[PDB]
């Protein structure tokens, strides 16, 4: 009669909380999805070994179209867990799944875990300063989406930072690199001409948040657009005007260029 | 030899990540601060038991003025951990502590944990739609803070949701309730008369996120301002423009008035 939405955390199998693990171990059935994000520092096998339960993976269609006939039926007579990377309900559509549970007479509880939304705090950028967030999508066919560029413009205009998620093809396991993200934004700038993203724009790249050795880099596009940030996934941030302490942290921790202490503060 | 910034999570000792627990267990010295937030479902005793180490609690003064005198010295010859509620670098000034560590020749690592910043997901509000965040502070003497009101105005203007961290006076055991926050806001509205926060404003309250049964309520200020939302900690959220599914979740899960199902596009 109970469904537990349990977050898996940022990087590897140890990013799940003690509460989430203990609850997952007591569940009769455990489902998981890895289409919204992928746990780059571990594997399904390692996660299954830690939880000590067989994990049935669900595709996007399984969830969005058939959550009520795949997961909920079992949650009516047993304790069921639904595992997701990061913090449950961060993914836009996930919250609605609790409404489906209700309508099916199934109770649901949420067990939180670290999310990139809060983990980006490791860049030294003040969390309260983040504005609306967005996702950089690949252009294709006759479709060139550029809304993420407008998001950056509006936030920046108000001195706010912009958290940018990069495109991902979970199934195909193909990621968009921060490098590719920068190339696309430069292309959009050439069309929009809004002076929002140029070779002189200061950006921050975060890779493998959650690991003991994440990659945190900050600098100007002209210098970072060809740098090697390691294996995906990458997160790109376009910070608004920086608080002095933010710039110093980037300089001291992320090896940012001295220049930003005077140019972007 | 090294310093660990380890987050403890939202509610109780089990909100720490497996990674954080296993590392905390093998540290020679463990320090902690419990003034940046309230973990209403645990005690120092329970935390010490889980980690199996004695924890020396530091005050805001100990940290902000003497971190390099109390913590760092030991990190030069031992493995030290500094524990904090939620995520160590979120809505705190702890990021700056890493600079002190570096300048002292001490390498540091960060172990994230569930944070209120991402936990807002349980409100059903799309996380990407939150804009600049703010803190509602207790007026002090003739000083009556009001900046948070302008933040709400800026966000609502963009149709973005506003997350409001609430004040805390740890040494006085004082934790601002959502009720007190709304009262202060109504008073600021009377002074500024910007039509930003009135009795008809839709607000969302999230109390004791992280527990298995947090209080999640949504509705008009006039109806919520005197409602008992349970023990602290609380956060107040003032949504911007709602998507259909957001409104639906507020009604179905947060008990909002069914008329809120209708949205003014
Ligand atoms: N579990 C919880 N439930 C509701 N509000 C919470 C909360 N934890 C923190 N808060 C809010 O956040 C404020 C502290 S700011 C510190 C946040 C912490 N670093 C984190 O990552 O979560 C509290 O005063 C309250 O306003
Ligand atoms: Na945000």
């Amino acid at each position: 009669m109970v469904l537990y939405f349990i977050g898996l955390g940022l990087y590897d199998e140890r990013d799940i909380t003690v509460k989430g693990l203990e609850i997952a171990k007591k569940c009769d059935y455990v489902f998981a999805e890895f289409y919204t994000s992928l746990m780059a520092g571990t594997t399904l096998g390692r996660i299954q070994k830690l939880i000590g339960k067989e994990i049935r993976v669900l595709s996007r269609e399984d969830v969005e179209l058939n959550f009520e006939n795949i997961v909920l039926p079992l949650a009516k007579e047993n304790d069921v867990a639904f595992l997701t990377p990061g913090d449950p309900l961060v993914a836009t559509t996930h919250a609605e799944l609790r409404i489906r549970a209700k309508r099916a007479g199934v109770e649901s509880y949420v067990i939180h875990a670290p999310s990139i939304y809060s983990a980006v705090g490791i860049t030294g950028l003040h969390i309260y300063k983040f504005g609306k967030s967005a996702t950089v999508a690949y252009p294709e066919g006759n479709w060139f989406p550029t809304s993420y560029y407008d998001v950056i413009k509006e936030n920046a205009e108000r001195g706010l930072h912009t958290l940018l998620f990069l495109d991902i093809k979970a199934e195909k396991r193909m990621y968009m690199t921060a490098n590719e993200a920068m190339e696309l934004l430069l292309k959009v700038e050439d069309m929009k001409k809004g002076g929002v993203f140029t070779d002189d724009t200061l950006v921050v790249v975060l890779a493998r948040a959650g690991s003991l050795n994440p990659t945190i880099r900050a600098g100007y596009v002209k210098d970072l657009i060809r740098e090697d940030f390691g294996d995906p996934p990458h997160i790109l941030i376009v910070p608004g005007k920086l608080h002095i302490v933010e710039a110093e942290y980037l300089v001291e921790i992320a090896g940012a260029p001295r220049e930003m202490l005077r140019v972007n503060v």
Side-chain angles (χ1 to χ4, degrees), chain A residues 192-204:
Chain A
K192 284 258 161 123
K193 245 95 176 185
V196 178
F197 198 91
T198 69
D199 279 308
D200 300 311
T201 298
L202 174 78
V203 305
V204 177

Side-chain angles (χ1 to χ4, degrees), chain A residues 5-13 15-17 31-44 47 51 55-58 63 82-92 94 110-117 165 168 170 173 175 209 233:
Chain A
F5 288 77
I6 304 177
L8 279 188
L10 294 159
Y11 194 51
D12 53 55
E13 77 283 345
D15 282 357
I16 184 180
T17 61
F31 293 87
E33 63 84 2
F34 298 103
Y35 64 79
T36 58
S37 176
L38 284 178
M39 303 295 285
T42 195
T43 64
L44 183 60
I47 292 169
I51 298 178
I55 296 174
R56 178 183 173 178
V57 180
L58 301 177
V63 176
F82 177 50
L83 310 177
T84 63
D87 189 354
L89 275 70
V90 162
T92 300
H94 274 14
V110 182
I111 310 303
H112 300 282
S115 168
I116 187 62
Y117 269 100
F165 288 88
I168 175 181
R173 309 200 139 250
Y175 294 90

Side-chain angles (χ1 to χ4, degrees), chain A residues 183-233:
Chain A
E183 287 277 22
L184 262 180
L185 281 161
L186 284 178
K187 192 174 180 182
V188 176
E189 173 59 50
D190 190 352
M191 294 169 65
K192 284 258 161 123
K193 245 95 176 185
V196 178
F197 198 91
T198 69
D199 279 308
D200 300 311
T201 298
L202 174 78
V203 305
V204 177
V205 176
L206 177 60
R208 303 182 299 287
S211 173
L212 292 182
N213 299 290
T215 296
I216 310 171
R217 292 289 298 102
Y220 300 108
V221 175
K222 56 181 169 58
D223 302 302
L224 277 53
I225 195 174
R226 287 184 314 278
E227 189 176 318
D228 183 57
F229 308 114
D231 297 305

